[PDB]
Structure 1
Amino acid sequence: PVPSRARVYTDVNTHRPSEYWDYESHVVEWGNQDDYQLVRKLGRGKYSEVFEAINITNNEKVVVKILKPVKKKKIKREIKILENLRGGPNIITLADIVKDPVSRTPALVFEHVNNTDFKQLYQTLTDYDIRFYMYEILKALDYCHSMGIMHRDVKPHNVMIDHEHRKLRLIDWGLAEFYHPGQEYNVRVASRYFKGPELLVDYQMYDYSLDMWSLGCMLASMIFRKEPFFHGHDNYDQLVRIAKVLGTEDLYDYIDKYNIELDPRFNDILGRHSRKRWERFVHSENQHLVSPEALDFLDKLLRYDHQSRLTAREAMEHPYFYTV
């Protein structure tokens, strides 16, 4: 395959000391698990169990993410990234790291966010609200990309919103990675509906632009009231669902540009599809959230060619946000 590199923040990690990005050498230091009393179960993650807790030293509510330690290196990576990004705009704050003495189980302690229901948000958000929150996510992405980090798991479940306080936090940094130009990354990242075409065609030299694809998927779902927007039933079918909207000609152009070899499993499912018009998704139930600026913005995120997508900084300058 033809090599590629990010159009922005390309060399941020190259020009930083090894300590910043070498998470395997990061020294983790435990806090006191006895400072925290678990209150109730919140949600159960693929790699974790989440609880609401009280920090008994200051009477503050926190969230405790108990991690089943399947892989030690992965935990160190999440911790290092959270420490690096701590205090960034709209980045979840890691408050502490604790261990359960008897079971030797690690847990991450975060600032508590009173999360508005996804279904509730879908029903009541206004056109202005969608622009406001999309801009808040962009602040988080432009910051983490500027810090040489790709989130790689951008999706609604990883975006906590306290609608009452208009507060947004990008969470679950468990799949996040440091961007090093020329590096070949594992394509088995992100959640199916949000996986960029680069991951689906097994193009390993991807970058921050993967997060911009995921963000486009979110925007498309909310403005069109179609969740998820690209409803794949498996990783191969996910590429067909995208191909049904963006057409198959630009898919081959993208494959040819980077000399990508398509897996044989695509041969009998991919087919031939025309490029569709974003206006075809407009209906009576979603027209109050769609505008020419929204469609132009979406068209600039949802592109096969990862290099052609708006960067988070370019996205922040789009007319869709002139009202925020």
Structure 2
Amino acid sequence: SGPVPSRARVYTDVNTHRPREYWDYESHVVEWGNQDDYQLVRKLGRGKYSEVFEAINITNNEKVVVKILKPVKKKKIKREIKILENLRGGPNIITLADIVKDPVSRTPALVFEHVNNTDFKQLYQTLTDYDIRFYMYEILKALDYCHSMGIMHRDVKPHNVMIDHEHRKLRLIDWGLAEFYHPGQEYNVRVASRYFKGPELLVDYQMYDYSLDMWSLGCMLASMIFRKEPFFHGHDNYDQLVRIAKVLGTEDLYDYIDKYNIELDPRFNDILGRHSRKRWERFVHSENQHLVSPEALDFLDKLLRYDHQSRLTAREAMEHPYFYTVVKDQ
């Protein structure tokens, strides 16, 4: 018959109450900055969608980060820029400072406020129980804010959360896959990085929402408290669902496909099998026990649900007992 429709439980209609200019990004007019304003210092990183540099703004001597965009549909560039503008000033959202035309690629180059990251490959190895709660709490601020502003990030993962540890400062970056949420919309499921993909994406359920970001956040949390990064390490999108199903169980998976009347890809038949839902204690060992508590597990559990409608909202997440001590010190 066709899948059963779905709606975000919170912030459902925020965009519909906005001026259409707010979410109708195809009509956004970019006003360029001056590209002689910025001199590239060095290359920071290379991605699928861009190359990232450190630069100097020579007008005022400030350090900035410059993201030179690889060729992509102009619609996608307008979308990212409109999102960054709408979210600018929000808590723990990276600040877009300027937009220029790179003299070389002739593509757009986005200029952001500088940040001084400790790459997560060295950081997560050193994080205390307390730091994990503190940093999780700061991410939830960014996600509740962007959710409330009608936007889903759709690529939550360790690379996209910059932490200046020395200053206890966090920024959620890379809004290039972010989208405006509209009730009844069917989205592309080919978003997010494989290990952070929600079940909705893996079984091709298109009518998803903000709650996608909460599953991703759950994957990050799992890898920090168990010290296994990435946590669900699949080889492809098929094997990714199988790795999840080995932990969350198959009974809940099939109740979820039955509930939304999802057409499961024939390819999943012989690979999924039958799997009991595991107790989190099986991932606890001597090297990670100091990071795992009854609170951490209750919280993780409430994020990692197949049924996207069942997961905590970012705001519910923030009232969880896991964060009592960080809410107090703040």
Cα distance, 1:70 vs structure 2: 2.1
Q: CA–CA distance in 1 between the matches of 2:216 and 2:313? A: 12
Cα distance, 1:268 vs structure 2: 1.5
Between the two proteins, the alignment pairs up a number of residues equal to 323
CA contact (8 A) 1:69 1:75 kept: no
Counterpart for residue 143 of structure 1: 145
CA contact (8 A) 1:89 1:139 kept: yes
Q: CA–CA distance in 1 between the matches of 2:125 and 2:43? A: 26
Q: CA–CA distance in 2 between the matches of 1:129 and 1:101? A: 42
Cα distance, 1:102 vs structure 2: 5.5
CA RMSD of aligned residues (A): 0.7
CA contact (8 A) 1:48 1:67 kept: yes
CA contact (8 A) 1:35 1:56 kept: yes
Q: CA–CA distance in 1 between the matches of 2:201 and 2:55? A: 37
> Is the alpha carbon distance of 1:106 and 1:288 closer, same or farther for their aligned partners in structure 2, counting shifts above 3 Å?
same
CA contact (8 A) 2:97 2:111 kept: yes
Q: CA–CA distance in 2 between the matches of 1:190 and 1:119? A: 19
Q: Which of residues 95, 102, 111 in structure 2 aligns to 1:100? A: 102
Counterpart for residue 81 of structure 1: 83
Structure 2, unaligned runs of 5 or more: 326-330
Counterpart for residue 275 of structure 2: 273
Cα distance, 1:14 vs structure 2: 1.0
CA contact (8 A) 2:233 2:240 kept: yes
CA contact (8 A) 2:245 2:253 kept: yes
CA contact (8 A) 1:232 1:238 kept: yes
Instruction: Give me the TM-score of the superposition, normalised by structure 1.
Output: 0.99
Instruction: Give me the TM-score of the superposition, normalised by structure 2.
Output: 0.97
Deviations 1:211-267 (A, max 9, x none): 000000000000000111111100011100000000000000000000001001111
SS at match of 1:14: helix
Deviations 1:9-43 (A, max 9, x none): 00100111110000000010110000000000001
Q: CA–CA distance in 2 between the matches of 1:25 and 1:61? A: 31
> Is the alpha carbon distance of 1:33 and 1:257 closer, same or farther for their aligned partners in structure 2, counting shifts above 3 Å?
same
**4+ residue runs of structure 1 moved beyond 2 angstroms?**
100-103
CA contact (8 A) 2:68 2:102 kept: no
Deviations 1:91-132 (A, max 9, x none): 000000000246422100001111012122112110000000
SS at match of 2:112: strand
> Is the alpha carbon distance of 1:102 and 1:158 closer, same or farther for their aligned partners in structure 2, counting shifts above 3 Å?
closer
CA contact (8 A) 2:188 2:206 kept: yes
Deviations 1:38-57 (A, max 9, x none): 00000101110000000011
Q: CA–CA distance in 2 between the matches of 1:114 and 1:102? A: 27
Counterpart for residue 306 of structure 2: 304
Q: CA–CA distance in 2 between the matches of 1:41 and 1:60? A: 17
CA contact (8 A) 1:98 1:106 kept: yes
Deviations 1:51-70 (A, max 9, x none): 00000111110000000122
CA contact (8 A) 2:4 2:260 kept: yes
SS at match of 1:322: helix
SS at match of 1:267: helix
Counterpart for residue 116 of structure 1: 118
> Is the alpha carbon distance of 1:292 and 1:103 closer, same or farther for their aligned partners in structure 2, counting shifts above 3 Å?
closer
- Percent identity at matched positions? 100
CA contact (8 A) 1:149 1:208 kept: yes
CA contact (8 A) 1:42 1:52 kept: yes
Deviations 1:168-205 (A, max 9, x none): 00000000000001100000000000000000000000
> Is the alpha carbon distance of 1:41 and 1:283 closer, same or farther for their aligned partners in structure 2, counting shifts above 3 Å?
same
Deviations 1:288-312 (A, max 9, x none): 1111000000000000000000000
Q: CA–CA distance in 2 between the matches of 1:101 and 1:235? A: 38
SS at match of 1:203: coil
Q: CA–CA distance in 1 between the matches of 2:65 and 2:36? A: 15
Q: CA–CA distance in 1 between the matches of 2:48 and 2:219? A: 21
Q: Which of residues 126, 129, 142 in structure 1 aligns to 2:128? A: 126
Q: CA–CA distance in 1 between the matches of 2:151 and 2:235? A: 29
Q: CA–CA distance in 2 between the matches of 1:157 and 1:102? A: 27
